[PDB]
Structure 1
Amino acid sequence: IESIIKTATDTVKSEINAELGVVPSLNAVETGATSNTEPEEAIQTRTVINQHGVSETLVENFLSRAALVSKRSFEYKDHTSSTAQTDKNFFKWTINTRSFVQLRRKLELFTYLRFDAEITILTTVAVNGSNNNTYVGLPDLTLQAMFVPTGALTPEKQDSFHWQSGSNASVFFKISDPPARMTIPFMCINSAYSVFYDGFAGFEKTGLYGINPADTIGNLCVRIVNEHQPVGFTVTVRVYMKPKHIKAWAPRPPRTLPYMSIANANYKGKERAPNALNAIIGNRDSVKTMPHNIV
């Protein structure tokens, strides 16, 4: 308690401490972690002043790395001609951390995190080659990114008249521009985002498991403002979220197995070790057989 430490703690000089009646090293695992520090026993330490970096391993410094959460390469064309559930120039991405396993593992390190989502939407254009179209320049489309809370009706078209944004939060940013550095706040009715939720969203028995109703931030409906071009482009909208203002609670085992589903934590490892169900760590030849040995 009451530790306001900014640097790594310095070790003090240790002597021959061979004392009867008390012992530092023989601790009890069956309470928690142990208190045997370096000059207490097992080594005769030297007084070294420790000036090592603790700011770089802060939990805010750990978690305010803007990583990908949704990469949608939606096809921008006259979708009217022929399109069925084909991202008609707009996708209604329900805001979930869980789509990309790097930042998903970073936020699933902790049970609870209160943070503000610095959402940066980097959008890249590519001319689609299925129609054998020429390059003909990469256009500077103004791309609307409307964040709708839950309960608000998501749009169904590109010109769906729900993009008026009378009260909905939206940004209007072009592609030949810096990306939309927007900050979605702590959009939770509870005091933290329950990244893990051992409960059901609905009061009914048939509700989906693991999705916190408090953590339904909503949908980030991203659309193309201007009308369809005669040449089709593949607009790839990559939304990157930087957990800013980090307050984390209850650190957890990291997810060792490869992720399977967004909505739950269902697991199946690789076919052998490493990161397998029956063997998380890659197996050695024997218990005493030592790998990566200089000889």
Structure 2
Amino acid sequence: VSETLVENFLSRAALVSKRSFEYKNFFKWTINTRSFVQLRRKLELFTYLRFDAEITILTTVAPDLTLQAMFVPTGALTPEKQDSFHWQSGSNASVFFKISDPPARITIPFMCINSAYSVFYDGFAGFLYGINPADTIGNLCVRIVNEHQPVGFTVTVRVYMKPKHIKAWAPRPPRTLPYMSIANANY
């Protein structure tokens, strides 16, 4: 059966983030995949897995505006103001795309230092419970590149993720009680 393979079981390409901004001015979203409880529960079934991202950014506005989307891996600095000199740095993946074009697409390869992502980490960092310092990937910062037109803007950004090239290890029983937070697995 070609349907039930794990490479086909986790390739849904669902939404993860949707946060608009009105014309702080730039959108910064962490890459943690524990955003929606629909996708989070499907990743609870496996202990260790390994994949790549394939980010797609869809943008609609309420006009020939140009958008920059920069990916920043872990360890490098993240910008705090829109016109900062971190945006001009070329040691990180940036993509420049308009609104009128079809939406942008970029894939992010496997960047843990171990052999796989550790979904569950029964251990401590330094000295925190359940935080593996080699697990996190980075964050993508999306700003606009224009002088602002003093009219009514509403720029809404949607981000989609298709994890492909899946490999899985050690299946685990699913979660039946609803979540309390996204930091840990309370009930």
Asked whether the two chains share a fold, i.e. TM above 0.5, the reply is yes
Q: Which runs of 5+ in 2 are unaligned?
A: none
Q: Distance in 1 between matches of 2:38 and 2:28?
A: 22
Distance 1:238 1:256, change over 3 A: farther
Which of residues 23, 39, 48 in structure 2 aligns to 1:112?
48
Q: Distance in 1 between matches of 2:53 and 2:60?
A: 21
Distance 1:201 1:67, change over 3 A: farther
Which of residues 61, 70, 74 in structure 1 aligns to 2:8?
61
Q: Distance in 1 between matches of 2:129 and 2:66?
A: 38
Q: CA deviation at 1:246?
A: 0.3
Q: Distance in 2 between matches of 1:255 and 1:118?
A: 27
Q: Which runs of 5+ in 1 are unaligned?
A: 1-53, 77-87, 127-138, 268-295
Q: CA deviation at 1:113?
A: 1.1
Q: CA deviation at 1:92?
A: 2.1
Larger Rg: 1
Q: Is the 8 A contact 1:144 1:171 kept in 2?
A: yes
Aligned length in residues: 187
Q: CA deviation at 1:149?
A: 1.3
1:282-293 equivalences under 5 Å are: none
Q: CA deviation at 1:257?
A: 2.6
Using the size of structure 1 for normalisation, the TM-score is: 0.59
Q: Distance in 1 between matches of 2:45 and 2:12?
A: 14
CA offsets 1:100-123 (integer angstroms, 9 cap, x no match): 112222222211111011111112
Which shifted more, 112-121 or 66-75?
A: 66-75
Distance 1:258 1:123, change over 3 A: farther
Q: CA deviation at 1:159?
A: 1.1
Distance 1:95 1:141, change over 3 A: same
More strand by share: 2
Q: CA deviation at 1:184?
A: 0.5
Q: CA deviation at 1:259?
A: 2.7
Q: Distance in 2 between matches of 1:210 and 1:140?
A: 45
Q: Is the 8 A contact 1:63 1:106 kept in 2?
A: yes
CA offsets 1:184-240 (integer angstroms, 9 cap, x no match): 00021111111222222334xxxx321221111111111111122212423222211
3-state DSSP of counterpart to 1:60: helix
Distance 1:213 1:230, change over 3 A: same
* Identity across matched positions, percent: 99
Using the size of structure 2 for normalisation, the TM-score is: 0.91
Q: CA deviation at 1:242?
A: 0.7
